[PDB]
């Protein structure tokens, strides 16, 4: 009865955001174009490939050091290695929880988050349970995020909503629930779905969640132009494995 009451309260908060979006939303940029240093500061330089080797992670970390990226993002098995490689730098170690499908038991996601932080993760990017969101099981989706957030209280949790599988209302619902569960960021995509970041999705998400929560744009971000566009429409972070070519394109075409 408490959880059905909370389900009801969540539904009302979603409806209020949907109503406001319908009456007031306008798609427009949040800022003028970003520079090279802004782009570097946004980048979480990523290798989440299942075939990544320890030497690949060593190379990723070196690249993050060389280009002064905000952080690296690696699979959980490589968190201690990235921490070791990055010891003494301010480069953050980000890993992924319940990734990329988001369809693990909640307690698995919570355990994985705890293990990640024990291994030296600074931030967690989790995947939402997309199927249960689409089924309008708001309380399940809320408790699933909440359990991770609580389990690593004090550490940054980002919620990947996986926009490629969502309609507009569901995008809004995912953002509202993520905010209510006490997550610090929402994130567009895993890069393992049918689509990645769009300016439209980034802007909507930033408009719903506000200035106090972050938006991380990821999936398909290949160039300096892609990075600048996502930042221009409200992204605070960029997830990409193309950090090096992004910096090179910026230097070549915009330097």
């Amino acid at each position: 009865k408490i959880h059905h009451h909370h389900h009801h309260m969540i539904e009302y908060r979603i409806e209020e955001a949907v109503a406001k979006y319908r009456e007031f939303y306008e798609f427009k940029p949040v800022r003028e174009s970003a520079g090279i240093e802004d782009v570097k500061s946004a980048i979480e330089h990523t290798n989440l490939k299942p075939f990544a080797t320890p030497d690949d992670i060593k190379k990723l970390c070196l690249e993050a050091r060389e280009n002064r990226f905000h952080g690296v993002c690696v699979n959980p098995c490589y968190v201690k290695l990235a921490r070791e490689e990055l010891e003494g730098t301010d480069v953050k170690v980000v890993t992924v929880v319940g990734f990329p499908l988001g369809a693990n038991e909640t307690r698995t996601k919570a355990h994985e988050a705890i293990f990640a932080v024990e291994s030296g993760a600074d931030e967690i990017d989790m995947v939402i349970n997309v199927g249960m969101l689409k089924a309008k099981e708001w309380e399940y989706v809320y408790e699933d995020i909440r359990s991770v957030v609580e389990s690593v209280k004090g550490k940054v949790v980002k919620v990947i909503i996986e926009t490629c599988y969502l309609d507009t209302e569901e995008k809004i619902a995912a953002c509202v629930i993520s905010k209510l569960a006490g997550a610090h960021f929402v994130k567009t995509s895993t890069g393992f779905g049918t689509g990645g970041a769009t300016a439209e999705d980034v802007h909507l998400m930033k408009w719903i969640v506000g200035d106090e929560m972050g938006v991380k744009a990821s999936g398909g971000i290949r160039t300096f132009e892609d990075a600048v566009k996502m930042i221009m429409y409200g992204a605070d972070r960029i997830g990409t494995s193309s950090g090096v070519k992004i910096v090179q394109g910026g230097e070549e075409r915009y330097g």
Copy 2:
């Protein structure tokens, strides 16, 4: 002592398998044909889509009952539901561990496997750490599988080797290691990589693992003829989401 020496013993076993493969291997069928009843009994009727809803899982389970499939395969968040839906039937509930990327900490995989069995799973399809396998970290890969096998003693564990990312010596290594670690099956694919089951892969794996270990062919198996081919070349189980069309396909064209 234990780890460096286990590393060494595994390398020698892999070398022995590779030597035998080079000396004696022949690609050819293991049986003349398979009929509709054999195919039904091989099929693990699957929905691992991240956007799968409770209703989709209810439909999958109904389809498994109507067609007398061996099992259903679902993500861990739905094991309890599948079990509830299949109560009073002998349809197995299979789930996936460390799936599809295989790059979780070993302890996350082992906990996920335990949590699945507690939630009612009969069998576990885990994903190998592909990157550590490619880096020839045999003891890491071995312990990763061994930890899961032992955590769910008495339940079938299948190791997904993810053939699409592997060369021939790597496929042999993954099979040798899965065998050594006490897994009951090797499985071709996740369906989330760059390729799925081939007859050449199924047959190589069966030849390496032998008569008392299983091979589960998965990924890209869309038709009855696809299903029959894999069985002819050594598959004991078939992972597919196309179970209903596979069966209707064979009934129509073969009786």
